[PDB]
Amino acid sequence: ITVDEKLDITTITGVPEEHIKTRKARIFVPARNNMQSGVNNTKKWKMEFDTRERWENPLMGWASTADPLSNLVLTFSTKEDAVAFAEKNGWSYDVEERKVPKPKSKSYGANFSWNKRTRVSTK
């Protein structure tokens, strides 16, 4: 069998060059591009790294660049394995929080009052 149970926090290295200690990741929730109202693009945690300089390429004006990562987003399942991926390869990060709104109390019929203020007109 050769099970040999032991314990160590798995920090793997050698596969990148230097950008372990240089950068800091970010875990957050994408929340409702507000030109419309589709809520399908919630429920999945994503990541994005540091943004570095974008200069002008002096022949066209293209957005040529250094900063070799700059485009890496993965699709996470939840907050639980969100941390566990950033530590398993081991570079710094910072975590946001999921925002869910009010439930909330909305009821038609109270928009026509005898003495209240909740009263609509000009419909």
Partner: protein, 306 residues
């Protein structure tokens, strides 16, 4: 103004202009200038094919080629009207069958001490030699020091660079040795008196320019190039045959690119370890290269293994 890493495809602010740049010295200098990235403007004389091996150093849009004679004025003016700095390294050995060869070190550095200077350039740098003195030797060695003073009237602050003898890959002085497969290998001239001069290494030459190109404050304060440790011996000629174990010419051959049994043979055997009060290389640091490590590379003869 600069932007980002200067690995490749950067801007780095500077816009230079290097004349000549087809020989051993002028090519290898520009091969650093297209690495950090800039608008390198190199005009060549009469050679479309002889710059083909030059292009894969500047990435894209960084180099540009123009045509010029030198005795004409505006061809040396139309190109240089938009730049920041400009260096020059133009010149060669023996007198042409058509040229004049005296004023080429006099009026041709003056032809770019023209409106070129007036146009608004700065940090204009010319080349010198360590042995170019006003003394009566030689026909080529002197008449180089004439340009060191008579053209120094113009450009009152330049930091004209003064190199010693250089050794690299495809020069003339070190390849003058071991191209002497002959019925007798004689030194110059069967005497170990003055040998040798200061063979500075070619990486130190191109490193001195790029530190000085935005140093700052290096105008007028002319500089000298230190060689190796320390003077050198007669052993060098024996050092050749020991370890060696004893470009637009023509379509068939050039009739005269000779060994020149004339004042060529004395322009190197006139050493002149000159004044050490010039700053001139270690202060424009950092340049420190021996001889014994770079000698395997340039020498190439029939054994090649042992």
């Amino acid at each position: 103004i600069p932007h980002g890493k200067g690995g490749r495809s950067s801007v780095s602010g500077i816009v230079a202009t290097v004349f000549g740049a087809t020989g051993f010295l002028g090519r290898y200098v520009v091969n650093h200038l297209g690495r950090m990235g800039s608008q390198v403007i190199v005009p060549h004389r009469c050679e479309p094919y002889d710059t083909m091996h030059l292009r894969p150093m500047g990435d894209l849009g960084q180099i540009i080629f123009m045509d010029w004679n030198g005795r004409d004025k505006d061809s040396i003016r139309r190109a240089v009207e938009h730049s920041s700095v400009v260096i020059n390294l133009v010149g060669r050995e023996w007198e042409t069958q058509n040229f004049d060869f005296e004023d080429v070190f006099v009026k041709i550095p003056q032809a770019i001490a023209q409106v070129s200077k007036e146009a608004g350039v700065e940090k204009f740098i010319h080349i010198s030699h360590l042995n170019a003195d006003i003394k009566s030797s030689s026909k080529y060695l002197r008449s180089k020091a004439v340009g060191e003073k008579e053209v120094r009237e113009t450009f009152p602050e330049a930091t004209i660079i003064k190199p010693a003898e250089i050794f690299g890959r495809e020069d003339r002085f070190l390849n003058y040795f071991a191209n002497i497969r002959w019925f007798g290998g004689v030194p110059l001239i069967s005497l170990g008196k003055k040998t040798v001069k200061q063979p500075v290494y070619i990486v130190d030459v191109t490193k001195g320019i790029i530190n000085a190109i935005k140093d700052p404050d290096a105008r007028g304060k002319t500089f000298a190039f230190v060689g190796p440790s320390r003077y050198l011996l007669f052993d060098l000629v024996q050092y050749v045959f020991a370890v060696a174990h004893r470009i637009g010419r023509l379509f068939e051959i050039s009739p005269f690119e000779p060994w020149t049994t004339r004042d060529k043979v004395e322009r190197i055997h006139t050493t002149d370890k000159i004044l050490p009060h010039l700053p001139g290389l270690e202060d424009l640091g950092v340049e420190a290269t021996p001889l014994e490590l770079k000698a395997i590379e340039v020498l190439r003869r029939h054994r090649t293994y042992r």
